[PDB]
Amino acid sequence: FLKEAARKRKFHVIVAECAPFCQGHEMAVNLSKAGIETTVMTDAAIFAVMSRVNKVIIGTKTILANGALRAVTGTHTLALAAKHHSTPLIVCAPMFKLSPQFPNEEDSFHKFVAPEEVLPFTEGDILEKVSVHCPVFDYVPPELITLFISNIGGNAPSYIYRLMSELYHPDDHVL
Amino acid sequence: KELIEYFKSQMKEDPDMASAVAAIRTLLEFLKRDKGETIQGLRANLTSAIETLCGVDSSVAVSSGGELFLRFISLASLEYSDYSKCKKIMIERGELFLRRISLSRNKIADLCHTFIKDGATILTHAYSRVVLRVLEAAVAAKKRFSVYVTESQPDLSGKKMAKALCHLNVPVTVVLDAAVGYIMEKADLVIVGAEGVVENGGIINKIGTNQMAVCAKAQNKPFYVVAESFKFVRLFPLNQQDVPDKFKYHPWVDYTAPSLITLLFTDLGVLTPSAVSDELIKLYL
Amino acid sequence: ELIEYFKSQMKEDPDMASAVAAIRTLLEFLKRDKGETIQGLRANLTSAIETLCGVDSSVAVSSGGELFLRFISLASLEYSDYSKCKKIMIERGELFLRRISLSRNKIADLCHTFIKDGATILTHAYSRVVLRVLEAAVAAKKRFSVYVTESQPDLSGKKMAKALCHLNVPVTVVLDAAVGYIMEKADLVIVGAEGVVENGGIINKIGTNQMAVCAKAQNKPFYVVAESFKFVRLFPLNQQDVPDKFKYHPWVDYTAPSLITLLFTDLGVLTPSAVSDELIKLYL
């Protein structure tokens, strides 16, 4: 989306990663080298600069049957922040991830990794009593996405149950 | 008039089920009637006049349910080739309608009860007849939680939910009606039964609903509502003056604003506060 | 020696407020069983009456007592004899009682030109301060109908209707749960506080938080009245922060502190964030 938008037009992207372990740097370098003029941001100073930003676009991993979305880490916080400035937040997820799960019906769609991801093992005798933990995902409520970008075109944030009634067999939610 | 006495017998002969389903049962058992021997006047005008007579109660659900099974008989009570088996003998389609929306309570019990998060307490509103069975199926599947009830006070009705729940060994505490603002932070998510669901997505129910929803929005906590296939309606409120006055009655039932709810259940399934519109428009083609 | 003196003033005279009754009780109870010293008398007997008066479930009482002890602290001189420490310097307390009785007159004088005609009013349970300002508003030859709620730990709101129809305005009571049914009807929601705290929080009876959350739900301005007494010195955050002895089925809850819009007292009109500015001006 970004590099094809940059293929004719000009902008200035500013990017905070997601880092219990980082991978936003990979996109940062991957579109450092097609001439985009990115800034890579720490994952906390969003609120310092999102007052000055005017649009914000994230890409999730899977979106579910509330019209909602479990995304990568740190998306709920930046999404609520962007609601606080009322600037529109755009999910660029296709018609391919739409899933009949519902958030707290199941057992902890946030689930967890080895926290050596989030702790260096070299600190001493500190780690025995403490039970550190971190998830792989977040959860954003479906009131908060402004507009999908599917393949067929922009669709409503709550355009979802008819998508499931005539894009699935909704009797087969046995799975 | 001559058969509203049987509706009184159906309201106070088996007081477990709902009012609207007792009305549907009443009239469809009356379809062994004194033979009017016609399709047009009998069905259309006579069941219309029976909806007018049985709508003399202060219910909102009963008349809407009567119109709803009028639409559920408007499907294919056809002109099939002779006046022997049009509907007055081929009558079993309304019977299977009655059976489906009898087992609808059981399928709501099978669906919703695996959503309640164990540990966070859930304050409920006054006694419905679908909150009891979803809590029955929840505690039947070995959960742990707490539950409070507000009184919902024109009359004491929260202790009626207490005498409902306490018979099956589940902890509960009745809490003051105007003081739900104190207990709102204590709960994390809030379920409430329905007298009926509106096309905008809000609910209509006995009075103590909208302040629960707006305190839920202030605490940014999920507001949950539950309804069945009987309780759809065609009303449209904007601010509260426009529920009909015969459906108002110091309100005895009340509307809450449409989409500061967060999630909603029905017999068609768990759905979204704009999906309400298209999924009731699916009914009555 | 004074406990049924205080209860005589309390429930054989329901005219004045509880805080002003308590401060009249101890100000006339400077005629003490004579220990005749500055510090010890003060400390033990005033803290002792603030303890022994704790059979009631109010919150204005101990605050008014501590406000009086911060009153008496300031101009207490030293001039070589134990006669005019305060045992002769007692007319300061007399002028204090009359000025903070005249306080209710001056909030009536401040807010009589403040409710506009045509604006209907929804109100919570009773005070000895809502009626004086509303009848100093009616006595300016205005006109406005009023709604009021039930406020159920009891049949309460009927008392407010009986008081105010006798005070000649059209009154209509409503059920407690019917607030958002009729909140949008109102143009103005005024609230007599129980006790005002330094962040704009108003701890009060069981439904003023309802009024605030519905007021931000309607963006209609939410006005609270308090006198010079009942600035209590707690600090609340949430719904367990106020002490349990103030509560006891709860009986007191706590509204949010940052959403009320205009308050007013003896010292004039205050935006509800200047409450800390004047409370630092209090207790010396």
Side-chain angles (χ1 to χ4, degrees):
Chain A
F1 181 77
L2 269 73
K3 287 191 283 187
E4 199 273 333
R7 194 258 297 165
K8 293 188 287 184
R9 293 177 184 173
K10 183 260 181 294
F11 55 88
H12 182 194
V13 64
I14 53 100
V15 174
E17 75 269 16
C18 59
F21 74 103
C22 177
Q23 63 181 355
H25 290 171
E26 298 293 325
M27 183 272 298
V29 175
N30 195 359
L31 51 89
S32 296
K33 66 184 179 68
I36 286 94
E37 178 60 26
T38 84
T39 80
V40 71
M41 190 64 71
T42 185
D43 299 341
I46 294 99
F47 187 77
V49 299
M50 184 269 305
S51 175
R52 194 183 179 273
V53 83
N54 54 9
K55 290 180 182 177
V56 54
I57 284 91
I58 48 96
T60 70
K61 191 175 181 182
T62 168
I63 49 100
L64 70 157
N66 199 4
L69 64 163
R70 70 277 302 276
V72 300
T73 54
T75 49
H76 185 82
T77 172
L78 187 145
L80 269 297
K83 189 262 290 181
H84 186 272
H85 280 285
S86 176
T87 59
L89 184 272
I90 299 97
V91 46
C92 58
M95 284 181 66
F96 188 75
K97 278 77 178 171
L98 184 58
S99 64
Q101 294 290 103
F102 288 98
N104 293 117
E105 291 292 337
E106 56 95 37
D107 45 356
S108 180
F109 62 96
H110 309 93
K111 64 183 183 179
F112 312 102
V113 287
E116 189 65 30
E117 167 172 343
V118 297
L119 273 307
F121 202 82
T122 170
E123 78 275 16
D125 203 1
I126 297 168
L127 71 100
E128 173 61 34
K129 291 171 70 176
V130 58
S131 66
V132 295
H133 64 282
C134 62
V136 299
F137 290 157
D138 298 337
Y139 175 68
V140 180
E143 53 88 23
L144 197 58
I145 46 171
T146 305
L147 171 55
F148 288 103
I149 297 174
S150 68
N151 51 0
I152 59 171
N155 299 319
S158 297
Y159 189 64
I160 306 300
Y161 188 75
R162 61 94 44 80
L163 261 284
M164 285 187 177
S165 68
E166 295 180 356
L167 273 299
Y168 282 98
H169 186 193
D171 296 333
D172 294 329
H173 293 168
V174 184
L175 281 306
Chain B
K1 178 66 175 66
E2 69 271 17
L3 266 299
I4 196 166
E5 297 89 3
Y6 191 74
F7 176 67
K8 299 287 182 181
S9 75
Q10 292 301 109
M11 72 170 70
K12 289 184 179 180
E13 189 174 1
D14 190 3
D16 184 73
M17 293 73 170
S19 298
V21 64
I24 306 306
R25 186 176 177 88
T26 299
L27 197 271
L28 197 274
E29 287 180 353
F30 181 64
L31 263 74
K32 62 177 76 66
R33 71 187 302 277
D34 299 329
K35 275 80 70 177
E37 291 290 328
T38 178
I39 299 171
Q40 180 265 331
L42 197 286
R43 275 74 179 172
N45 199 358
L46 290 185
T47 62
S48 298
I50 290 166
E51 291 185 5
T52 64
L53 69 88
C54 71
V56 72
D57 56 352
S58 65
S59 175
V60 184
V62 171
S63 296
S64 64
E67 197 276 335
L68 190 270
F69 97 102
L70 193 276
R71 296 289 188 175
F72 269 93
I73 197 171
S74 178
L75 22 73
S77 292
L78 293 172
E79 54 271 13
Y80 178 66
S81 295
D82 52 356
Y83 192 78
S84 66
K85 294 176 287 293
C86 294
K87 185 66 184 172
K88 74 281 188 197
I89 289 180
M90 188 185 74
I91 204 165
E92 70 273 15
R93 188 162 179 174
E95 296 176 355
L96 66 90
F97 172 73
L98 192 275
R99 290 189 294 272
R100 283 174 63 87
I101 319 296
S102 295
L103 61 90
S104 64
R105 190 176 182 181
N106 196 359
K107 73 176 180 175
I108 285 295
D110 293 330
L111 179 61
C112 184
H113 73 282
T114 177
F115 191 74
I116 38 96
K117 189 258 183 67
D118 295 329
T121 185
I122 299 165
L123 61 92
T124 189
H125 191 262
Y127 178 80
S128 74
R129 290 169 181 170
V130 74
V131 166
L132 69 93
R133 184 57 64 89
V134 68
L135 284 178
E136 198 276 334
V139 182
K142 275 77 176 175
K143 303 294 185 290
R144 67 184 187 275
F145 62 97
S146 178
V147 56
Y148 297 97
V149 192
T150 193
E151 293 95 4
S152 301
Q153 184 64 252
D155 53 352
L156 180 65
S157 65
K159 293 188 179 68
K160 198 260 181 67
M161 186 60 203
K163 69 184 285 293
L165 184 61
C166 292
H167 192 275
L168 272 303
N169 294 317
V170 175
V172 73
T173 301
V174 182
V175 70
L176 276 76
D177 197 0
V180 296
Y182 172 76
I183 200 170
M184 192 65 205
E185 180 65 29
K186 295 294 187 293
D188 191 72
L189 57 96
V190 279
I191 58 100
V192 50
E195 291 290 330
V197 67
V198 83
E199 304 198 6
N200 290 320
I203 211 70
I204 56 98
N205 194 358
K206 289 193 283 185
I207 180 62
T209 59
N210 56 358
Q211 75 277 28
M212 288 179 178
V214 71
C215 291
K217 181 62 184 296
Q219 305 306 107
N220 202 357
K221 288 185 175 182
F223 189 79
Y224 290 151
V225 295
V226 54
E228 61 180 358
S229 177
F230 283 143
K231 287 184 179 180
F232 292 90
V233 80
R234 283 85 168 275
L235 196 271
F236 307 109
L238 307 182
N239 50 2
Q240 301 299 111
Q241 286 74 253
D242 46 4
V243 290
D245 52 356
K246 89 287 288 180
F247 284 163
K248 287 184 176 67
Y249 296 148
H250 301 287
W252 189 68
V253 289
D254 188 73
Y255 170 77
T256 180
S259 295
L260 78 166
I261 67 167
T262 53
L263 192 277
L264 63 155
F265 297 99
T266 186
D267 288 329
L268 296 175
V270 40
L271 77 165
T272 307
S274 78
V276 47
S277 176
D278 186 75
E279 290 298 325
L280 59 88
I281 289 298
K282 187 261 180 184
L283 280 311
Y284 55 96
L285 281 76
Chain C
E1 69 275 14
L2 78 156
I3 53 173
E4 189 60 32
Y5 182 80
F6 173 73
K7 292 299 181 183
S8 66
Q9 291 294 110
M10 179 53 68
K11 295 297 187 288
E12 280 80 359
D13 193 3
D15 193 1
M16 293 76 166
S18 295
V20 67
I23 196 166
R24 286 171 64 90
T25 300
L26 85 156
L27 197 279
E28 296 184 357
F29 193 73
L30 269 76
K31 54 181 72 65
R32 298 186 180 92
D33 298 333
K34 291 179 173 64
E36 294 292 328
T37 188
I38 298 173
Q39 179 262 325
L41 183 276
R42 189 269 308 159
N44 66 5
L45 284 181
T46 58
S47 298
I49 59 95
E50 289 175 353
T51 56
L52 271 67
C53 76
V55 70
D56 56 354
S57 67
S58 176
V59 66
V61 180
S62 302
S63 65
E66 201 275 336
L67 262 293
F68 178 70
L69 267 303
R70 292 291 191 180
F71 158 72
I72 197 167
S73 179
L74 192 274
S76 298
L77 287 174
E78 71 272 14
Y79 291 164
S80 294
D81 57 351
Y82 193 76
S83 64
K84 65 271 289 180
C85 295
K86 289 279 104 178
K87 303 296 286 183
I88 288 172
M89 290 301 292
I90 193 172
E91 70 274 14
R92 192 194 178 194
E94 185 180 3
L95 66 89
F96 184 77
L97 287 189
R98 67 179 174 86
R99 287 177 187 271
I100 318 298
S101 66
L102 178 142
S103 66
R104 199 171 64 93
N105 192 4
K106 298 306 287 184
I107 56 92
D109 198 4
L110 188 274
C111 196
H112 74 281
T113 323
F114 191 69
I115 300 172
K116 192 67 71 70
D117 270 331
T120 185
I121 298 170
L122 184 272
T123 308
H124 71 101
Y126 183 76
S127 76
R128 279 76 174 265
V129 73
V130 167
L131 294 184
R132 188 180 181 89
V133 60
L134 265 74
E135 291 298 321
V138 171
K141 296 178 77 174
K142 303 295 190 291
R143 57 99 175 173
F144 57 97
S145 179
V146 64
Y147 297 98
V148 72
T149 186
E150 175 76 26
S151 294
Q152 174 58 252
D154 54 351
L155 182 61
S156 68
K158 184 69 176 178
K159 182 256 191 68
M160 296 57 147
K162 289 183 185 295
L164 195 57
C165 286
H166 183 274
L167 291 171
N168 195 5
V169 96
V171 184
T172 297
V173 75
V174 77
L175 277 70
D176 282 329
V179 279
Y181 176 75
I182 206 161
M183 177 62 200
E184 57 90 32
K185 293 287 184 67
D187 198 6
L188 191 61
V189 179
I190 45 93
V191 46
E194 185 73 23
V196 46
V197 79
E198 289 87 0
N199 58 1
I202 301 299
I203 40 98
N204 204 352
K205 281 91 178 67
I206 65 172
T208 57
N209 53 0
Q210 302 290 321
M211 303 305 173
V213 63
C214 294
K216 190 176 71 65
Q218 301 299 112
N219 198 358
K220 296 194 286 186
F222 186 69
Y223 295 152
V224 64
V225 51
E227 68 270 12
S228 176
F229 291 118
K230 59 184 183 184
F231 303 102
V232 193
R233 278 83 182 275
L234 286 174
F235 198 87
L237 297 174
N238 55 2
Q239 295 303 104
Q240 283 301 115
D241 50 13
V242 295
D244 184 75
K245 63 181 72 66
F246 291 159
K247 300 181 179 67
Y248 295 161
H249 295 281
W251 188 70
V252 174
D253 52 357
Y254 165 66
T255 192
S258 298
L259 84 173
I260 68 171
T261 308
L262 192 63
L263 56 92
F264 52 91
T265 179
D266 195 4
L267 292 170
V269 188
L270 276 75
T271 300
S273 60
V275 58
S276 176
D277 303 335
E278 295 296 327
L279 262 291
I280 295 297
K281 194 263 183 182
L282 265 296
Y283 57 100
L284 280 75

